[PDB]
């Protein structure tokens, strides 16, 4: 048989069934985590049974995603590894890439621009270390310093360079505010540079799709 | 008559009267909601009379907006349905599109790139689910965890992915701050990719307008 | 005379003196507002004498700025009009445009793209009114509603559309957070449309001057 | 010798050793600042011995960075100068530029675009002064003013112009919120204007290096 | 983006 990869009149209903099952599994995940809540386990078992059935029908990276989606359930049959498997259960969301034409374009854009992504993470790491050390040593003299240590300032440097915002910020001297202004400017610039190459690769793969 | 569709032969008086009545209705809406406050109903009835007269003399999406602008006033003549009709009264603001040549360019841009908006909402959905699950499972081990559940973290993931800012963020461990840094960078990238196609569509329609 | 426009050698030192006097007047302004504080008035009178001497040597918008720079000092020789004149004293900072070759490029960019700036302010007004009405009617049913009225929500809609961040946001229901996410994404899309035309013309003017 | 500046099979060993030593020095910095903490001084002495050996073997700007990386260690062998030297110790992070081909592209982009960087800092200074004085005089009439002085408003104007977010903003009147909305719009426009030439210079150097 | 700040590079929009 092996009609699944092709999209025929009898196959498109199978694709709709797979997309609905994936969305139902994601919903069961986000709902079973809720404080108000066995009945979820039955739906999760049905979803994993459909997943294993599709994988056996197909038995690249999408196959690795199909395997990773099923692995955590079979593992369940210190505490940190249990929380890690409960977290890696989320990877079921990536099976939408099998059906989504646009998500594959994003994956090809990421594979085609790993160097720019590494350059972006490098610039963020350099700016974070620099502005964290600067704001900490600016605050070192004041009594009851806002930043206990340079690593403590990493979160403030990250939220400032990305223009997310640290929220409350008042208990800070003039030098810390000057370093924060420079941090915001430099973070806007460093975020602004690698991005256009990635946007160009995405637009290229997208228009190649059409 | 049929003077309304063309703004010519001294029909500009009718167009300025329509724009003034629309702005007056919007102001009456925003002031009627004020805590300090019958006379507002009189001005609202006058604006509705002008709207229904313009529509009945005029007799596409613009006619649908002209109908929706006047339906809620007549519907008034579960409390949630009352709140919904009071909210849908706002749609009078879209009557300006008939007079604003630039707003129609925005409507043509939104129509030409519906796939772009869908891809953008899809990327935000995937990123919100992923980073919410990550930050929640990172916070699960702490006492008095800041995030009661994955759905509870959806708002934090949205405000971080868009670089709006969650505000206060202290009661969070190192792993949550790491996930938040990754969330800010990934939101930067995910909102940086579909948008330029929409900008190109808007720039093309704007140059076509002149 | 008339060496001021055509800078040469002796006319160059006059330009550096004018720039120093302008910066000194701005510093005297920002220091005169300080809580810790006659001596400031003497430096202000000296800067006003230099400004009036340059203006009388001069005898377009540049002369208008030169007039506005000295008007408040001579007006001083309800309380709200006094606060307004103390505010309009700040316009001395625009005297730098005569010496800053880049600031004139910014002024030509603003004059050459007024239609785009107005279209941007229009889109912001539309989005602010719409999302403010939405978030208010979403919060109306909750006890101790966060938003007393739609106008009260205008500041939240403005900081969300521009992604500045409202700060603490917890006392809000699910519908208000949904409207806030939609407001954030729509704010990305609105501001990011008009802007490229203002860049294109700014870049044109800049490189033409180059 | 001069074995360092080639790509010989022995040379990659020395390159990876220098990169690991630079990263270990940055780590020793960031952990020696920690509240929980001689053993760090031994690793610092080893990193400085390696840096001085690399410098004495090597013997522009790169040599100046290599000098600055080792100067603070030998300086130790008012308190404010001690804080300044402890801060300038961070410059070891810039030794990575010798190995990172992308960091040199960033340095060439900065050297080649000093003029627009100065224009951007100029626009930020102008907008900060203007909006700070505006929000201060708008808030001057309220009892218990949120802004004690125009300089006190500089941090708010900076975080708003860059859309980082001041945090809580409620104790402010209508006029201050209006000035804040204008500040957010103008800051987005003034930040966006000079970036694109910097991005174009960066992509030019990145493709010339390709 | 918001402050992702795309620098265009879509052929300047071809206009
Ligand atoms: K932002
Ligand atoms: K923000």
Residue numbers in the entry:
A (entry chain D), B (entry chain B), C (entry chain A), D (entry chain C): 216 to 252, 277 to 298, 310 to 327, 357 to 489
E (entry chain G): 1 to 15
Paper text:
Here we investigate the mechanism of fast inactivation in the Shaker Kv channel using cryo-electron microscopy, mass spectrometry and electrophysiology. We resolved structures of a fully inactivated state in which the non-polar end of the N terminus plugs the internal pore in an extended conformation. The N-terminal methionine is deleted, leaving an alanine that is acetylated and interacts with a pore-lining isoleucine residue where RNA editing regulates fast inactivation. Opening of the internal activation gate is required for fast inactivation because it enables the plug domain to block the pore and repositions gate residues to interact with and stabilize that domain.
To mitigate proteolysis of the N terminus, we expressed a construct containing mVenus and the affinity purification tag on the N terminus, enabling us to purify the protein with at least one N terminus intact within individual tetramers. To capture the inactivated state of GT Shaker, we reconstituted the protein into nanodiscs and were able to obtain randomly oriented particles for cryo-EM imaging. We therefore used a cylindrical mask covering an asymmetric region of the protein to initially obtain a low-resolution map containing an L-shaped density in the region of interest and then used an L-shape mask during further 3D classification to obtain three classes (A–C) that contained additional density within the pore or chamber. In each of these cryo-EM maps, the voltage-sensing domains are activated and the internal S6 gate open. In class A resolved to 2.94 Å, the additional density fully plugs the internal pore in an extended conformation; in class B, the additional density is positioned at the internal end of the pore; and in class C, the additional density begins to enter the internal pore. Density corresponding to the additional two residues present in this construct is visible within class A, curling towards the intracellular end of the pore to form an inverted J shape.
